[PDB]
Amino acid sequence: GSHMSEEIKRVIDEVDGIRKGLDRSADPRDPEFLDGLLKQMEKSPHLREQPIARALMEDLRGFAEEPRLLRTKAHVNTRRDQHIFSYFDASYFPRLSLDYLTYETLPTHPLLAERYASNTMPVNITACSEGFESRVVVALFPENHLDGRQDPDDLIFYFINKFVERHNRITRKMIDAVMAPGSFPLIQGADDDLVESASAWWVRLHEFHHRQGDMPIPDYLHAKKLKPLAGLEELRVDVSSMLVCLNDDELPADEARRAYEYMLAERLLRYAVEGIPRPNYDAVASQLLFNYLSENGGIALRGDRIHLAPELPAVLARFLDEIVTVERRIHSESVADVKAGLLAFTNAYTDYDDYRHIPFFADVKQRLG
Ligand SMILES: [Fe+2]
């Protein structure tokens, strides 16, 4: 390798060595645990030279008095370099602990980050410790750090290489075997660099739209924690994103179009089949959108193929309007009552027993891998 790449491998091999011996049953905030971790790190000769590791080490040393990873997050948020290293404690990323990555940025069109700014970093992982190999760890959020905090400057990271992989492994196959021929002309058989860019558009518009509307997630997180409502919210921001891709004609047309089709294929196909024995919240949301589209003339089933209707962009805007109409009630009714209204919308387009994978996708999951 190059000289840097060899040194990074030495840094990461040290991380992987400490990490695998850590008592993971312990409370990772316990001072004896952290002191012992600090001592292994202080005797870790390539790791302890890295600026991010020195920030982490000082944060950890002071953690009892100051339970913030203040220097670690300042390093990452200012992007002093493209190294991300910390001690993570995330319920839904259980394999993350003492973990280290380097990333490469992805170029995005200026009007995208200009008109639709958030603190979102779509990046590719270029090297990492074992925790970041977990296929589950497709993003990284400020509160996943040991201090559990999210603050207004914090950058959110999405590992686009992992989304491209999911597209290559599941979505492509599904487009061919599930959609009508000709459904997704700009993204069908598209090159990975083009999927990559579509996916970076998706995450950027996704996070932007979370913060938009009458019930934006920062403020209304708890209103939207129930599985159907968590899923309906993700649907709201993805459809909003799709519609920006169709309606904002100042965006480059091929890229916006490619992003649009990527988002719709991912939502209609890959997210719709996820689920151990039963659908997850993303799956239920895809079920919801699918049923809603069937029943309102956005898509039709014939031949065991989804056919995308000419007026799908109109049915999408109708869909988003029904959510916004319910969410606008927040300004005059109780949260409990607006939550009941959101729930009533989802129940009209899903099947609950937990939720059941709808029969069309039960057969696709059966038919395909
Ligand atoms: Fe989201």
Side-chain angles (χ1 to χ4, degrees), residues 206 209-212 215-218 224 227-238 267 285 323 327:
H206 189 92
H209 288 310
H210 272 317
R211 283 128 191 120
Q212 311 300 310
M215 288 175 73
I217 287 175
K224 289 175 174 174
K227 183 174 216 172
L229 297 197
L232 176 66
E233 170 59 16
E234 301 300 335
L235 220 40
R236 177 190 72 86
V237 296
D238 282 347
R267 198 41 94 172
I323 300 167
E327 290 188 353

mmCIF file with all atom_site columns, all heavy atoms in Angstrom, residues 206 209-212 215-218 224 227-238 267 285 323 327:
data_model
loop_
_atom_site.group_PDB
_atom_site.id
_atom_site.type_symbol
_atom_site.label_atom_id
_atom_site.label_alt_id
_atom_site.label_comp_id
_atom_site.label_asym_id
_atom_site.label_entity_id
_atom_site.label_seq_id
_atom_site.pdbx_PDB_ins_code
_atom_site.Cartn_x
_atom_site.Cartn_y
_atom_site.Cartn_z
_atom_site.occupancy
_atom_site.B_iso_or_equiv
_atom_site.pdbx_formal_charge
_atom_site.auth_seq_id
_atom_site.auth_comp_id
_atom_site.auth_asym_id
_atom_site.auth_atom_id
_atom_site.pdbx_PDB_model_num
ATOM 1   N N   . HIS A 1 206 ? -33.483 13.323 2.417  1.00 0.00 ? 206 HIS A N   1
ATOM 2   C CA  . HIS A 1 206 ? -34.059 12.661 3.575  1.00 0.00 ? 206 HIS A CA  1
ATOM 3   C C   . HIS A 1 206 ? -33.899 13.481 4.847  1.00 0.00 ? 206 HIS A C   1
ATOM 4   O O   . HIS A 1 206 ? -34.882 13.823 5.504  1.00 0.00 ? 206 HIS A O   1
ATOM 5   C CB  . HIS A 1 206 ? -33.387 11.305 3.742  1.00 0.00 ? 206 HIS A CB  1
ATOM 6   C CG  . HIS A 1 206 ? -34.038 10.447 4.768  1.00 0.00 ? 206 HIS A CG  1
ATOM 7   N ND1 . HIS A 1 206 ? -35.034 9.545  4.456  1.00 0.00 ? 206 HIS A ND1 1
ATOM 8   C CD2 . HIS A 1 206 ? -33.839 10.353 6.102  1.00 0.00 ? 206 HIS A CD2 1
ATOM 9   C CE1 . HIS A 1 206 ? -35.418 8.929  5.557  1.00 0.00 ? 206 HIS A CE1 1
ATOM 10  N NE2 . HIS A 1 206 ? -34.710 9.404  6.564  1.00 0.00 ? 206 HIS A NE2 1
ATOM 11  N N   . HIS A 1 209 ? -35.704 16.887 4.881  1.00 0.00 ? 209 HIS A N   1
ATOM 12  C CA  . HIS A 1 209 ? -37.151 16.875 5.040  1.00 0.00 ? 209 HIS A CA  1
ATOM 13  C C   . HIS A 1 209 ? -37.573 16.462 6.439  1.00 0.00 ? 209 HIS A C   1
ATOM 14  O O   . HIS A 1 209 ? -38.686 16.790 6.858  1.00 0.00 ? 209 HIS A O   1
ATOM 15  C CB  . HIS A 1 209 ? -37.755 15.985 3.954  1.00 0.00 ? 209 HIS A CB  1
ATOM 16  C CG  . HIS A 1 209 ? -37.684 16.603 2.591  1.00 0.00 ? 209 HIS A CG  1
ATOM 17  N ND1 . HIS A 1 209 ? -38.114 17.889 2.339  1.00 0.00 ? 209 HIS A ND1 1
ATOM 18  C CD2 . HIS A 1 209 ? -37.121 16.166 1.440  1.00 0.00 ? 209 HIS A CD2 1
ATOM 19  C CE1 . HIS A 1 209 ? -37.897 18.186 1.071  1.00 0.00 ? 209 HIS A CE1 1
ATOM 20  N NE2 . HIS A 1 209 ? -37.286 17.161 0.505  1.00 0.00 ? 209 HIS A NE2 1
ATOM 21  N N   . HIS A 1 210 ? -36.694 15.806 7.197  1.00 0.00 ? 210 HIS A N   1
ATOM 22  C CA  . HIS A 1 210 ? -37.036 15.503 8.586  1.00 0.00 ? 210 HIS A CA  1
ATOM 23  C C   . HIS A 1 210 ? -37.313 16.774 9.357  1.00 0.00 ? 210 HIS A C   1
ATOM 24  O O   . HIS A 1 210 ? -38.186 16.805 10.233 1.00 0.00 ? 210 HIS A O   1
ATOM 25  C CB  . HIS A 1 210 ? -35.903 14.769 9.285  1.00 0.00 ? 210 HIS A CB  1
ATOM 26  C CG  . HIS A 1 210 ? -35.962 13.296 9.127  1.00 0.00 ? 210 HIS A CG  1
ATOM 27  N ND1 . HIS A 1 210 ? -37.131 12.575 9.241  1.00 0.00 ? 210 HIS A ND1 1
ATOM 28  C CD2 . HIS A 1 210 ? -34.982 12.398 8.884  1.00 0.00 ? 210 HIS A CD2 1
ATOM 29  C CE1 . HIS A 1 210 ? -36.871 11.295 9.055  1.00 0.00 ? 210 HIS A CE1 1
ATOM 30  N NE2 . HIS A 1 210 ? -35.578 11.167 8.829  1.00 0.00 ? 210 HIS A NE2 1
ATOM 31  N N   . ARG A 1 211 ? -36.548 17.819 9.065  1.00 0.00 ? 211 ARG A N   1
ATOM 32  C CA  . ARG A 1 211 ? -36.609 19.077 9.781  1.00 0.00 ? 211 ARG A CA  1
ATOM 33  C C   . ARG A 1 211 ? -37.652 20.027 9.209  1.00 0.00 ? 211 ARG A C   1
ATOM 34  O O   . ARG A 1 211 ? -37.819 21.126 9.745  1.00 0.00 ? 211 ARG A O   1
ATOM 35  C CB  . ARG A 1 211 ? -35.207 19.697 9.804  1.00 0.00 ? 211 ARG A CB  1
ATOM 36  C CG  . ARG A 1 211 ? -34.338 18.989 10.839 1.00 0.00 ? 211 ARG A CG  1
ATOM 37  C CD  . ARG A 1 211 ? -33.006 18.494 10.302 1.00 0.00 ? 211 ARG A CD  1
ATOM 38  N NE  . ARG A 1 211 ? -32.358 17.605 11.269 1.00 0.00 ? 211 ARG A NE  1
ATOM 39  C CZ  . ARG A 1 211 ? -32.030 16.339 11.028 1.00 0.00 ? 211 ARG A CZ  1
ATOM 40  N NH1 . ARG A 1 211 ? -32.260 15.778 9.851  1.00 0.00 ? 211 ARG A NH1 1
ATOM 41  N NH2 . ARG A 1 211 ? -31.472 15.613 11.997 1.00 0.00 ? 211 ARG A NH2 1
ATOM 42  N N   . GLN A 1 212 ? -38.392 19.604 8.188  1.00 0.00 ? 212 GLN A N   1
ATOM 43  C CA  . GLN A 1 212 ? -39.441 20.397 7.568  1.00 0.00 ? 212 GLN A CA  1
ATOM 44  C C   . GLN A 1 212 ? -40.828 19.928 8.005  1.00 0.00 ? 212 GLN A C   1
ATOM 45  O O   . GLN A 1 212 ? -41.044 18.772 8.393  1.00 0.00 ? 212 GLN A O   1
ATOM 46  C CB  . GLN A 1 212 ? -39.356 20.316 6.043  1.00 0.00 ? 212 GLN A CB  1
ATOM 47  C CG  . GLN A 1 212 ? -37.990 20.562 5.499  1.00 0.00 ? 212 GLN A CG  1
ATOM 48  C CD  . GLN A 1 212 ? -37.461 21.927 5.860  1.00 0.00 ? 212 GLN A CD  1
ATOM 49  O OE1 . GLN A 1 212 ? -38.136 22.947 5.670  1.00 0.00 ? 212 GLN A OE1 1
ATOM 50  N NE2 . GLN A 1 212 ? -36.227 21.962 6.370  1.00 0.00 ? 212 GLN A NE2 1
ATOM 51  N N   . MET A 1 215 ? -44.541 18.897 11.955 1.00 0.00 ? 215 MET A N   1
ATOM 52  C CA  . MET A 1 215 ? -44.100 18.049 13.064 1.00 0.00 ? 215 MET A CA  1
ATOM 53  C C   . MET A 1 215 ? -42.700 17.497 12.801 1.00 0.00 ? 215 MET A C   1
ATOM 54  O O   . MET A 1 215 ? -42.499 16.280 12.709 1.00 0.00 ? 215 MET A O   1
ATOM 55  C CB  . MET A 1 215 ? -45.096 16.917 13.314 1.00 0.00 ? 215 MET A CB  1
ATOM 56  C CG  . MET A 1 215 ? -46.408 17.380 13.957 1.00 0.00 ? 215 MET A CG  1
ATOM 57  S SD  . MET A 1 215 ? -47.654 16.061 14.125 1.00 0.00 ? 215 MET A SD  1
ATOM 58  C CE  . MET A 1 215 ? -46.904 15.120 15.480 1.00 0.00 ? 215 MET A CE  1
ATOM 59  N N   . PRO A 1 216 ? -41.694 18.372 12.711 1.00 0.00 ? 216 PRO A N   1
ATOM 60  C CA  . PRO A 1 216 ? -40.343 17.911 12.346 1.00 0.00 ? 216 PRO A CA  1
ATOM 61  C C   . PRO A 1 216 ? -39.732 17.078 13.465 1.00 0.00 ? 216 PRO A C   1
ATOM 62  O O   . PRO A 1 216 ? -39.975 17.349 14.645 1.00 0.00 ? 216 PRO A O   1
ATOM 63  C CB  . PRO A 1 216 ? -39.575 19.222 12.132 1.00 0.00 ? 216 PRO A CB  1
ATOM 64  C CG  . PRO A 1 216 ? -40.301 20.198 13.030 1.00 0.00 ? 216 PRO A CG  1
ATOM 65  C CD  . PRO A 1 216 ? -41.742 19.833 12.911 1.00 0.00 ? 216 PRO A CD  1
ATOM 66  N N   . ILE A 1 217 ? -38.937 16.049 13.083 1.00 0.00 ? 217 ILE A N   1
ATOM 67  C CA  . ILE A 1 217 ? -38.530 15.018 14.057 1.00 0.00 ? 217 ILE A CA  1
ATOM 68  C C   . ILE A 1 217 ? -37.697 15.514 15.228 1.00 0.00 ? 217 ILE A C   1
ATOM 69  O O   . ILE A 1 217 ? -37.917 15.025 16.350 1.00 0.00 ? 217 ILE A O   1
ATOM 70  C CB  . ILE A 1 217 ? -37.821 13.837 13.370 1.00 0.00 ? 217 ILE A CB  1
ATOM 71  C CG1 . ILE A 1 217 ? -38.796 13.004 12.609 1.00 0.00 ? 217 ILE A CG1 1
ATOM 72  C CG2 . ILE A 1 217 ? -37.034 12.997 14.353 1.00 0.00 ? 217 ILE A CG2 1
ATOM 73  C CD1 . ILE A 1 217 ? -38.049 11.987 11.900 1.00 0.00 ? 217 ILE A CD1 1
ATOM 74  N N   . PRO A 1 218 ? -36.702 16.356 15.039 1.00 0.00 ? 218 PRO A N   1
ATOM 75  C CA  . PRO A 1 218 ? -36.040 16.897 16.235 1.00 0.00 ? 218 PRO A CA  1
ATOM 76  C C   . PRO A 1 218 ? -37.076 17.233 17.311 1.00 0.00 ? 218 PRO A C   1
ATOM 77  O O   . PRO A 1 218 ? -37.071 16.639 18.396 1.00 0.00 ? 218 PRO A O   1
ATOM 78  C CB  . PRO A 1 218 ? -35.296 18.124 15.690 1.00 0.00 ? 218 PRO A CB  1
ATOM 79  C CG  . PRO A 1 218 ? -35.021 17.735 14.245 1.00 0.00 ? 218 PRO A CG  1
ATOM 80  C CD  . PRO A 1 218 ? -36.249 17.024 13.803 1.00 0.00 ? 218 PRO A CD  1
ATOM 81  N N   . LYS A 1 224 ? -43.720 10.393 17.397 1.00 0.00 ? 224 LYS A N   1
ATOM 82  C CA  . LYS A 1 224 ? -43.617 9.517  16.235 1.00 0.00 ? 224 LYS A CA  1
ATOM 83  C C   . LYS A 1 224 ? -42.775 8.273  16.516 1.00 0.00 ? 224 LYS A C   1
ATOM 84  O O   . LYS A 1 224 ? -42.145 7.733  15.612 1.00 0.00 ? 224 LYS A O   1
ATOM 85  C CB  . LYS A 1 224 ? -43.049 10.300 15.053 1.00 0.00 ? 224 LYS A CB  1
ATOM 86  C CG  . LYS A 1 224 ? -44.044 11.326 14.491 1.00 0.00 ? 224 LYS A CG  1
ATOM 87  C CD  . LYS A 1 224 ? -43.420 12.180 13.410 1.00 0.00 ? 224 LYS A CD  1
ATOM 88  C CE  . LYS A 1 224 ? -44.456 13.070 12.768 1.00 0.00 ? 224 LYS A CE  1
ATOM 89  N NZ  . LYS A 1 224 ? -43.797 14.010 11.818 1.00 0.00 ? 224 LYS A NZ  1
ATOM 90  N N   . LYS A 1 227 ? -44.010 2.223  15.977 1.00 0.00 ? 227 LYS A N   1
ATOM 91  C CA  . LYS A 1 227 ? -43.655 1.590  14.709 1.00 0.00 ? 227 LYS A CA  1
ATOM 92  C C   . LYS A 1 227 ? -44.391 2.119  13.484 1.00 0.00 ? 227 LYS A C   1
ATOM 93  O O   . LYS A 1 227 ? -43.736 2.500  12.506 1.00 0.00 ? 227 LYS A O   1
ATOM 94  C CB  . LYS A 1 227 ? -43.916 0.079  14.761 1.00 0.00 ? 227 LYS A CB  1
ATOM 95  C CG  . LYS A 1 227 ? -43.509 -0.686 13.494 1.00 0.00 ? 227 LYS A CG  1
ATOM 96  C CD  . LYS A 1 227 ? -43.672 -2.195 13.688 1.00 0.00 ? 227 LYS A CD  1
ATOM 97  C CE  . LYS A 1 227 ? -42.612 -3.024 12.989 1.00 0.00 ? 227 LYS A CE  1
ATOM 98  N NZ  . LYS A 1 227 ? -42.751 -4.461 13.403 1.00 0.00 ? 227 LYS A NZ  1
ATOM 99  N N   . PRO A 1 228 ? -45.730 2.164  13.470 1.00 0.00 ? 228 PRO A N   1
ATOM 100 C CA  . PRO A 1 228 ? -46.390 2.724  12.286 1.00 0.00 ? 228 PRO A CA  1
ATOM 101 C C   . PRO A 1 228 ? -46.065 4.185  12.092 1.00 0.00 ? 228 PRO A C   1
ATOM 102 O O   . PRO A 1 228 ? -45.976 4.649  10.946 1.00 0.00 ? 228 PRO A O   1
ATOM 103 C CB  . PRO A 1 228 ? -47.884 2.521  12.562 1.00 0.00 ? 228 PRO A CB  1
ATOM 104 C CG  . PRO A 1 228 ? -47.993 2.248  14.006 1.00 0.00 ? 228 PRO A CG  1
ATOM 105 C CD  . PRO A 1 228 ? -46.710 1.670  14.457 1.00 0.00 ? 228 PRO A CD  1
ATOM 106 N N   . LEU A 1 229 ? -45.889 4.935  13.178 1.00 0.00 ? 229 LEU A N   1
ATOM 107 C CA  . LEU A 1 229 ? -45.632 6.362  13.026 1.00 0.00 ? 229 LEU A CA  1
ATOM 108 C C   . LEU A 1 229 ? -44.168 6.628  12.693 1.00 0.00 ? 229 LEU A C   1
ATOM 109 O O   . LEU A 1 229 ? -43.867 7.564  11.940 1.00 0.00 ? 229 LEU A O   1
ATOM 110 C CB  . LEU A 1 229 ? -46.054 7.128  14.293 1.00 0.00 ? 229 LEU A CB  1
ATOM 111 C CG  . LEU A 1 229 ? -47.535 7.124  14.721 1.00 0.00 ? 229 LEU A CG  1
ATOM 112 C CD1 . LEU A 1 229 ? -47.830 8.246  15.716 1.00 0.00 ? 229 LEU A CD1 1
ATOM 113 C CD2 . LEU A 1 229 ? -48.498 7.185  13.547 1.00 0.00 ? 229 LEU A CD2 1
ATOM 114 N N   . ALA A 1 230 ? -43.253 5.820  13.230 1.00 0.00 ? 230 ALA A N   1
ATOM 115 C CA  . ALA A 1 230 ? -41.855 5.923  12.819 1.00 0.00 ? 230 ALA A CA  1
ATOM 116 C C   . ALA A 1 230 ? -41.716 5.684  11.322 1.00 0.00 ? 230 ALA A C   1
ATOM 117 O O   . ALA A 1 230 ? -40.980 6.407  10.631 1.00 0.00 ? 230 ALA A O   1
ATOM 118 C CB  . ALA A 1 230 ? -40.995 4.937  13.606 1.00 0.00 ? 230 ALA A CB  1
ATOM 119 N N   . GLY A 1 231 ? -42.456 4.709  10.801 1.00 0.00 ? 231 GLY A N   1
ATOM 120 C CA  . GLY A 1 231 ? -42.424 4.370  9.393  1.00 0.00 ? 231 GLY A CA  1
ATOM 121 C C   . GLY A 1 231 ? -43.127 5.407  8.544  1.00 0.00 ? 231 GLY A C   1
ATOM 122 O O   . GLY A 1 231 ? -42.650 5.746  7.456  1.00 0.00 ? 231 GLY A O   1
ATOM 123 N N   . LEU A 1 232 ? -44.263 5.925  9.028  1.00 0.00 ? 232 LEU A N   1
ATOM 124 C CA  . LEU A 1 232 ? -44.970 6.948  8.264  1.00 0.00 ? 232 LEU A CA  1
ATOM 125 C C   . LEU A 1 232 ? -44.103 8.191  8.105  1.00 0.00 ? 232 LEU A C   1
ATOM 126 O O   . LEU A 1 232 ? -44.105 8.843  7.050  1.00 0.00 ? 232 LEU A O   1
ATOM 127 C CB  . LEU A 1 232 ? -46.293 7.311  8.940  1.00 0.00 ? 232 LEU A CB  1
ATOM 128 C CG  . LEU A 1 232 ? -46.999 8.459  8.201  1.00 0.00 ? 232 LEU A CG  1
ATOM 129 C CD1 . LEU A 1 232 ? -47.428 8.032  6.803  1.00 0.00 ? 232 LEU A CD1 1
ATOM 130 C CD2 . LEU A 1 232 ? -48.178 8.963  8.984  1.00 0.00 ? 232 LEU A CD2 1
ATOM 131 N N   . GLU A 1 233 ? -43.343 8.517  9.144  1.00 0.00 ? 233 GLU A N   1
ATOM 132 C CA  . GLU A 1 233 ? -42.463 9.670  9.101  1.00 0.00 ? 233 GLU A CA  1
ATOM 133 C C   . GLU A 1 233 ? -41.352 9.490  8.074  1.00 0.00 ? 233 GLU A C   1
ATOM 134 O O   . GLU A 1 233 ? -40.995 10.440 7.369  1.00 0.00 ? 233 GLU A O   1
ATOM 135 C CB  . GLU A 1 233 ? -41.902 9.910  10.499 1.00 0.00 ? 233 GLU A CB  1
ATOM 136 C CG  . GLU A 1 233 ? -40.797 10.912 10.569 1.00 0.00 ? 233 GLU A CG  1
ATOM 137 C CD  . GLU A 1 233 ? -41.146 12.302 10.061 1.00 0.00 ? 233 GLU A CD  1
ATOM 138 O OE1 . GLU A 1 233 ? -42.347 12.630 9.907  1.00 0.00 ? 233 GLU A OE1 1
ATOM 139 O OE2 . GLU A 1 233 ? -40.198 13.080 9.831  1.00 0.00 ? 233 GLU A OE2 1
ATOM 140 N N   . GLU A 1 234 ? -40.764 8.289  7.999  1.00 0.00 ? 234 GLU A N   1
ATOM 141 C CA  . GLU A 1 234 ? -39.724 8.053  7.001  1.00 0.00 ? 234 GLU A CA  1
ATOM 142 C C   . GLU A 1 234 ? -40.312 8.154  5.597  1.00 0.00 ? 234 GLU A C   1
ATOM 143 O O   . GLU A 1 234 ? -39.683 8.695  4.677  1.00 0.00 ? 234 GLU A O   1
ATOM 144 C CB  . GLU A 1 234 ? -39.083 6.678  7.221  1.00 0.00 ? 234 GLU A CB  1
ATOM 145 C CG  . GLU A 1 234 ? -38.435 6.464  8.581  1.00 0.00 ? 234 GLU A CG  1
ATOM 146 C CD  . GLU A 1 234 ? -37.328 7.438  8.883  1.00 0.00 ? 234 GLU A CD  1
ATOM 147 O OE1 . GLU A 1 234 ? -36.739 7.951  7.926  1.00 0.00 ? 234 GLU A OE1 1
ATOM 148 O OE2 . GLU A 1 234 ? -37.046 7.700  10.082 1.00 0.00 ? 234 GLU A OE2 1
ATOM 149 N N   . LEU A 1 235 ? -41.527 7.644  5.426  1.00 0.00 ? 235 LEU A N   1
ATOM 150 C CA  . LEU A 1 235 ? -42.255 7.811  4.175  1.00 0.00 ? 235 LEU A CA  1
ATOM 151 C C   . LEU A 1 235 ? -42.461 9.273  3.838  1.00 0.00 ? 235 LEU A C   1
ATOM 152 O O   . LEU A 1 235 ? -42.349 9.671  2.672  1.00 0.00 ? 235 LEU A O   1
ATOM 153 C CB  . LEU A 1 235 ? -43.603 7.121  4.295  1.00 0.00 ? 235 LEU A CB  1
ATOM 154 C CG  . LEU A 1 235 ? -44.132 6.357  3.118  1.00 0.00 ? 235 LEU A CG  1
ATOM 155 C CD1 . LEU A 1 235 ? -42.977 5.590  2.448  1.00 0.00 ? 235 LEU A CD1 1
ATOM 156 C CD2 . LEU A 1 235 ? -45.173 5.424  3.701  1.00 0.00 ? 235 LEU A CD2 1
ATOM 157 N N   . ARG A 1 236 ? -42.814 10.086 4.838  1.00 0.00 ? 236 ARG A N   1
ATOM 158 C CA  . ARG A 1 236 ? -43.081 11.495 4.560  1.00 0.00 ? 236 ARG A CA  1
ATOM 159 C C   . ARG A 1 236 ? -41.848 12.168 3.970  1.00 0.00 ? 236 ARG A C   1
ATOM 160 O O   . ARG A 1 236 ? -41.943 12.905 2.979  1.00 0.00 ? 236 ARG A O   1
ATOM 161 C CB  . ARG A 1 236 ? -43.550 12.210 5.837  1.00 0.00 ? 236 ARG A CB  1
ATOM 162 C CG  . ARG A 1 236 ? -43.785 13.708 5.670  1.00 0.00 ? 236 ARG A CG  1
ATOM 163 C CD  . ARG A 1 236 ? -44.017 14.419 7.008  1.00 0.00 ? 236 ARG A CD  1
ATOM 164 N NE  . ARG A 1 236 ? -42.817 14.543 7.834  1.00 0.00 ? 236 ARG A NE  1
ATOM 165 C CZ  . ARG A 1 236 ? -41.931 15.526 7.732  1.00 0.00 ? 236 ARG A CZ  1
ATOM 166 N NH1 . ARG A 1 236 ? -42.050 16.471 6.816  1.00 0.00 ? 236 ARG A NH1 1
ATOM 167 N NH2 . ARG A 1 236 ? -40.889 15.554 8.563  1.00 0.00 ? 236 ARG A NH2 1
ATOM 168 N N   . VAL A 1 237 ? -40.678 11.894 4.548  1.00 0.00 ? 237 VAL A N   1
ATOM 169 C CA  . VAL A 1 237 ? -39.474 12.590 4.123  1.00 0.00 ? 237 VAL A CA  1
ATOM 170 C C   . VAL A 1 237 ? -38.930 12.012 2.814  1.00 0.00 ? 237 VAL A C   1
ATOM 171 O O   . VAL A 1 237 ? -38.267 12.731 2.056  1.00 0.00 ? 237 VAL A O   1
ATOM 172 C CB  . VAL A 1 237 ? -38.412 12.579 5.239  1.00 0.00 ? 237 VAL A CB  1
ATOM 173 C CG1 . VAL A 1 237 ? -38.912 13.352 6.462  1.00 0.00 ? 237 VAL A CG1 1
ATOM 174 C CG2 . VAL A 1 237 ? -38.048 11.176 5.642  1.00 0.00 ? 237 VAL A CG2 1
ATOM 175 N N   . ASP A 1 238 ? -39.195 10.728 2.513  1.00 0.00 ? 238 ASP A N   1
ATOM 176 C CA  . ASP A 1 238 ? -38.708 10.145 1.260  1.00 0.00 ? 238 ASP A CA  1
ATOM 177 C C   . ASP A 1 238 ? -39.582 10.581 0.088  1.00 0.00 ? 238 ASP A C   1
ATOM 178 O O   . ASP A 1 238 ? -39.064 10.933 -0.981 1.00 0.00 ? 238 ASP A O   1
ATOM 179 C CB  . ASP A 1 238 ? -38.689 8.609  1.321  1.00 0.00 ? 238 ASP A CB  1
ATOM 180 C CG  . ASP A 1 238 ? -37.493 8.032  2.099  1.00 0.00 ? 238 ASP A CG  1
ATOM 181 O OD1 . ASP A 1 238 ? -36.511 8.736  2.409  1.00 0.00 ? 238 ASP A OD1 1
ATOM 182 O OD2 . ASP A 1 238 ? -37.544 6.816  2.390  1.00 0.00 ? 238 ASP A OD2 1
ATOM 183 N N   . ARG A 1 267 ? -37.790 2.181  -1.927 1.00 0.00 ? 267 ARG A N   1
ATOM 184 C CA  . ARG A 1 267 ? -38.953 2.185  -1.049 1.00 0.00 ? 267 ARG A CA  1
ATOM 185 C C   . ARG A 1 267 ? -39.951 1.099  -1.454 1.00 0.00 ? 267 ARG A C   1
ATOM 186 O O   . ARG A 1 267 ? -40.460 0.361  -0.599 1.00 0.00 ? 267 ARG A O   1
ATOM 187 C CB  . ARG A 1 267 ? -39.591 3.580  -1.062 1.00 0.00 ? 267 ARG A CB  1
ATOM 188 C CG  . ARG A 1 267 ? -40.527 3.859  0.100  1.00 0.00 ? 267 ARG A CG  1
ATOM 189 C CD  . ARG A 1 267 ? -40.006 3.333  1.418  1.00 0.00 ? 267 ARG A CD  1
ATOM 190 N NE  . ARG A 1 267 ? -39.269 4.324  2.189  1.00 0.00 ? 267 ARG A NE  1
ATOM 191 C CZ  . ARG A 1 267 ? -38.872 4.122  3.435  1.00 0.00 ? 267 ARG A CZ  1
ATOM 192 N NH1 . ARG A 1 267 ? -39.113 2.977  4.055  1.00 0.00 ? 267 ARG A NH1 1
ATOM 193 N NH2 . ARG A 1 267 ? -38.201 5.079  4.069  1.00 0.00 ? 267 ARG A NH2 1
ATOM 194 N N   . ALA A 1 285 ? -43.864 0.843  6.507  1.00 0.00 ? 285 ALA A N   1
ATOM 195 C CA  . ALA A 1 285 ? -44.028 2.063  5.723  1.00 0.00 ? 285 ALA A CA  1
ATOM 196 C C   . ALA A 1 285 ? -44.094 1.773  4.225  1.00 0.00 ? 285 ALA A C   1
ATOM 197 O O   . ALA A 1 285 ? -44.927 2.341  3.509  1.00 0.00 ? 285 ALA A O   1
ATOM 198 C CB  . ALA A 1 285 ? -42.889 3.026  6.021  1.00 0.00 ? 285 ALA A CB  1
ATOM 199 N N   . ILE A 1 323 ? -50.719 13.373 4.654  1.00 0.00 ? 323 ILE A N   1
ATOM 200 C CA  . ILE A 1 323 ? -49.897 13.449 5.863  1.00 0.00 ? 323 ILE A CA  1
ATOM 201 C C   . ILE A 1 323 ? -49.857 14.875 6.382  1.00 0.00 ? 323 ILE A C   1
ATOM 202 O O   . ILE A 1 323 ? -50.027 15.122 7.577  1.00 0.00 ? 323 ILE A O   1
ATOM 203 C CB  . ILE A 1 323 ? -48.470 12.941 5.602  1.00 0.00 ? 323 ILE A CB  1
ATOM 204 C CG1 . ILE A 1 323 ? -48.450 11.485 5.133  1.00 0.00 ? 323 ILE A CG1 1
ATOM 205 C CG2 . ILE A 1 323 ? -47.618 13.153 6.853  1.00 0.00 ? 323 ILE A CG2 1
ATOM 206 C CD1 . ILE A 1 323 ? -47.075 11.080 4.581  1.00 0.00 ? 323 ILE A CD1 1
ATOM 207 N N   . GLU A 1 327 ? -50.815 16.374 9.969  1.00 0.00 ? 327 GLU A N   1
ATOM 208 C CA  . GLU A 1 327 ? -49.812 17.023 10.805 1.00 0.00 ? 327 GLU A CA  1
ATOM 209 C C   . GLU A 1 327 ? -50.122 18.495 11.063 1.00 0.00 ? 327 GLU A C   1
ATOM 210 O O   . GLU A 1 327 ? -49.731 19.025 12.109 1.00 0.00 ? 327 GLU A O   1
ATOM 211 C CB  . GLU A 1 327 ? -48.426 16.886 10.184 1.00 0.00 ? 327 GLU A CB  1
ATOM 212 C CG  . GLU A 1 327 ? -47.895 15.475 10.230 1.00 0.00 ? 327 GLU A CG  1
ATOM 213 C CD  . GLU A 1 327 ? -46.456 15.387 9.801  1.00 0.00 ? 327 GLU A CD  1
ATOM 214 O OE1 . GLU A 1 327 ? -45.890 16.406 9.334  1.00 0.00 ? 327 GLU A OE1 1
ATOM 215 O OE2 . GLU A 1 327 ? -45.882 14.293 9.934  1.00 0.00 ? 327 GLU A OE2 1
#
